[PDB]
């Protein structure tokens, strides 16, 4: 399956397009509760914060196994291109309090 | 050593609860149990999240945030324990809280704990 | 740690009685025995070992000073005690190959004279939050007829553990909450990030109803892992890193902030102390009073151990006493009854030092707990 | 203190390692743990066969065999370690010696080592 | 805790190399290490732990005194180390609830520089041997393609265990003997009740050949439970509680007796002197040198440590030195390479002391290995 | 199943009758290790010496249970009536070297 993932590893923020879709993180929180797209689009989240943080979908979510996303540092950032319509979980894994969802339509 | 008082950083022996790295970790130091600094010990797992700290380095005058990741699936190392808590938060705080055990996204699902790594992540300026 | 004054009377109390026997030609006839029944002065000692994969917890009756049992656990369980004394329990976890392989929590209960197993619960999932020992992470609705245990990963849930039934119930959502402390068979508040306090009540299936409080502390005001609750008298009793502590009575089934009091004076603040600890805090419900583990260190070592016990009384705020331990202790826990023991845990002796709670003196001691004990649990039989 | 010593029993405190029926336990005394001189404790199983060993009593002058019999089914207690081999034997004379854990019989067949009760079978020498 | 010479070198160095990387701007990039590849240095030390339910074995640079791995292990388990650094493997035991609950022997084979498991074999119906560690109860073939292990009760047996196949393949019945020692594939002598060895030789089924020697020591001379044995000399070497020393050549696949040595003299044994500790002896093979921890110590308190080893010529009895080791020794072993080290293992300090062979002199020290380490293992690389 | 208990434990040895079925116990032996006995016969052992003994027969021997007979000491005696034939080998627990045999015919 349900996501492709552009790049294995985090990269930096200023690689970002500018008309990219855009999750922000900063002060322990998601930029949006949920974010809607539509089948196809390539969401990237950016860490702005020194505190790091990734996005993880468990098991089931995207496909059979958990997609655990890499670990960001300030300043850096991580895609994932959603390629079935429907609704997904994530959360930070050292942070369950961070939770966000991708709305695919 | 009084147990009470300031806690003192130094930079010349990682062995040594002082370790200016060693500011918020808790367990034992993996390079006691064949890791390094940074790396695990062989056979253990690596966590990927963990409980993080920023430390000063005398050496250099900058504070480091240092991330206490877990080498997991280990019974504990028993070799050089340690527990310091320099900005240390309570549980409701997770992201600088260290009673934890910061085994998460290791191999395996490994959740055991053996040993703690004091890899820097980057500057806490 | 060799032989205690309690372990050299006991040890030759039972020289001699086994030389009677002996002389007497009285057979020996090995068999196992029981503990005496469940009183206010029986107290549990668990041992997390420091984060190894094996714990045990020292059942001890605290007026001899004598181990009357042992029970085993896995990885940093923790341990529940019906205050009615009727019963012991777990909730646990093991692994197929030591500290690897495949894992298993688990909820055990106990008869607390045999310590024989009466329940074996399955927990699916592998739930329990692996945390070093907070009592409160586990608790027993006030029926005893439900245990439940907080999971952290991979979002914040409370399981649901029908020991009546013996069997595991199910997960409730809950918000960005921590600890447990039930007040009714279907109702429980957790502490909050945002600093509020959460109700959950819930019933037999469906979302449970989650109300929360108004924040009652500042974000950089530091609540503590170990707070004192009596559920009982519905008395929660939460230090922060400064001896400041805030009250919320829970007995109406709502949450009521009682007015805030400081544990120490602001000449003490001024002059270095502070609390610091495990279990830095006790409470005993009959005297209304508040016990805290303080002496002088620097703000960052508040995990480290006191030798200091302030007395205070929890509606005046006014302190009591102040008693000089004369060890490294790391936990205080009362016996509930009338004129009741102080306990006094040092991880690092591994000793459990047994208090007069009224003088502050040093009654008797048992040595060789384990290998890092930090956890005293008393049950409230009055 | 000198543990090259001779061993030399005492008759009136049995949780000390010179108590004279515990000449040759192996592991920790029961008493400490919840058990009796001759009981488990609580939760336990208690083997039937077990080493031997004749002990002196030095109160009445007389050698009596002990059988050491284990407490099983629990990790070991961690209280009161003691290691006396008085005529203790090696393995090819498995009826005293006293590395074994003597746990067979047991209730639950219970197999673990948690501590060593000292009951008299009989007089010895 | 208190700190090793080795360990401070060896943290300092690590301390100023780390200061280097953060200096030329090197980002931590945390990942898991291998071992270095197994050497004539590489030593392993078990810890029983008193007879815990969870045990551990480290693995240890002997040259340059560091831990360069751990493998964890259940109740009491049996080590082995191929003598061509190939792989390492122990059979152990665990339990469904800790200690007690359902049974589970198996053999587990390690890489001996990942330390992962490449083999988990399950021993039918719990056969294992449960006994104070003895390391010739669990033995490797000369191939290293099976091990076998020691079965006491119900009737003495031995386990064979296919490790190339990775799997059980039969108990073989045995005469009233113990220990195993093997000298091919399918060849291996045992000690028996009566002073005789026997050998044993297997087919792929069926009953095995057993074939007793004479009777080569009387009944009231007591052989150690750990005797030496190299498998590439098929030496045996096997002191009594007096340091008597029987040797056995089994390099032919049978037992050819050589002369008995003393350790101690007629002066030594008037005054008190006998070999005590647990691993008592060590022999290395291309010097043909014998080891053996010595005391002076009463008859019966021969499980208790020593403070010297004293060093002979295996072929002629000769003695060639008599060291004073600074500590309470209760284990020795030696590399085998051609300038040894001698390992001297303190239980009551969990510290590997290591020592020139030749001069006696410590060289560096491990602490911190476990609850009471006993058993020293070396490859035979050469 | 093909034995029964007489009694659960051990019984003191003066309970024995004279003439009964005894196979006793002394010196680290079974005095009689191949016993010939009759179907419906009652077999006593009985220890002669301080150092406990038991008999233990093997899982499938008597039942499918094996039986663990209690330790007998000192004039300490223990019986089994075998109520079926064909031969019944047993040992003693502590001590496995010592075997004995009873033939039921
Ligand atoms: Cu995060
Ligand atoms: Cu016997």
């Known amino acids: 399956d349900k996501a492709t993932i552009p790049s294995e590893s985090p990269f930096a923020a200023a690689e970002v397009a500018d008309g990219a879709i855009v999750v922000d993180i900063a002060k322990m929180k998601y930029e ?45 950032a991580y895609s994932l291109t959603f ?10 894994t050292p942070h369950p309090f961070m939770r966000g969802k991708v709305v695919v339509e | 050593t009084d147990p009470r008082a300031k806690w003192v950083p130094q930079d010349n022996d990682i062995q040594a609860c002082d370790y200016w790295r060693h500011c918020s970790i808790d367990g034992n130091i993996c390079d006691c149990s064949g890791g390094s600094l940074t790396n695990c010990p062989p056979g253990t797992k690596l966590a990927t999240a ?8 005398p050496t250099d005058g900058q504070s480091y945030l ?35 055990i910061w085994c998460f996204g290791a191999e395996d699902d490994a959740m055991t704990y053996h040993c703690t790594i004091s890899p820097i992540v980057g500057k806490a300026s | 740690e060799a032989e205690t004054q309690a372990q050299e009377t006991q040890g030759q109390a039972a020289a001699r009685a086994a030389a009677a026997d002996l002389a007497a030609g009285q057979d020996d006839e090995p068999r196992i025995l029981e503990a005496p029944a469940p ?23 605290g007026e001899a000073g004598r181990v009357i ?44 004279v045999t310590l024989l197993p009466t329940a074996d619960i399955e927990l699916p999932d592998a739930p329990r939050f692996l945390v070093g020992t907070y009592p409160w992470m586990t608790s027993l ?4 007829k439900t245990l439940l245990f907080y999971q952290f990963s991979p979002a914040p849930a409370v399981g649901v553990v029908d020991l009546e039934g013996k069997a595991f119930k199910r997960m409730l959502d809950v918000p960005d909450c921590y600890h447990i402390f039930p007040t009714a068979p279907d109702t429980f508040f957790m502490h909050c990030r945002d600093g509020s306090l959460a109700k959950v009540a819930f019933g037999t299936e469906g979302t449970p109803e989650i109300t929360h409080t108004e924040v009652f502390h500042p974000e950089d005001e530091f609540l503590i892992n170990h707070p004192a609750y009596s559920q009982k008298a519905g008395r929660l009793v939460w230090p922060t890193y400064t001896g400041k502590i805030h009250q919320i009575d829970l007995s109406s089934g709502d949450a009521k902030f009682l007015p805030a009091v400081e544990a120490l004076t602001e000449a003490e603040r001024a002059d270095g102390w502070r609390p610091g600890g495990w279990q830095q805090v006790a409470y005993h419900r009959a005297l209304d009073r508040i016990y805290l583990l303080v002496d002088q260190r620097d ?43 102080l306990y006094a845990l040092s991880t690092g002796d591994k000793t459990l030092y047994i208090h007069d709670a009224e003088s502050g003196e040093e009654l008797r001691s048992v040595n060789q707990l384990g290998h890092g004990p930090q956890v005293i649990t008393t049950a409230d039989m009055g």
């Open chain 2, 50 to 57: 963990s409980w993080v700290a920023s430390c000063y380095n």
């Open chain 3, 141 to 144: 609705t006030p029926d005893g």
């Open chain 3, 299 to 341: 703000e960052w070592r508040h995990k480290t151990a006191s030798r200091f016990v302030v007395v205070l009384d929890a509606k005046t705020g006014e302190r009591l006493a102040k008693f000089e331990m004369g060890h490294e202790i790391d936990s205080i826990n009362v016996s509930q009854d009338e004129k009741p023991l």
């Open chain 3, 39 to 61: 009183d206010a002065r029986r107290v549990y000692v668990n041992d997390p070992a420091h984060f190894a994969a094996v714990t045990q917890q020292f059942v001890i009756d």
């Open chain 3, 69 to 112: 049992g042992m029970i085993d656990g896995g990885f940093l369980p923790n341990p529940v005690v019906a205050d009615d004394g009727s019963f012991i329990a777990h909730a646990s976890t093991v692994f197929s190959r030591i500290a690897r392989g495949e894992r298993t929590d688990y909820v055990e209960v106990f008869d607390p």
């Open chain 1, 32 to 76: 949006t509760p949920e974010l809607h797209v539509k089948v196809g689009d390539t969401v990237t989240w950016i860490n702005r914060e020194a505190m790091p943080h990734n996005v993880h979908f468990v098991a089931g979510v995207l496909g059979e196994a958990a997609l655990k996303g890499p670990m960001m540092k300030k300043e850096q």
């Open chain 2, 66 to 100: 240092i991330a206490y990741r877990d080498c997991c699936g280990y019974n504990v190392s028993g070799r050089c324990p340690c527990l310091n808590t320099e900005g240390e938060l309570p549980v409701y705080r997770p992201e600088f809280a260290n009673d934890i």
């Open chain 1, 83 to 92: 390629t079935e319509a429907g609704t997904y979980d994530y959360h930070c």
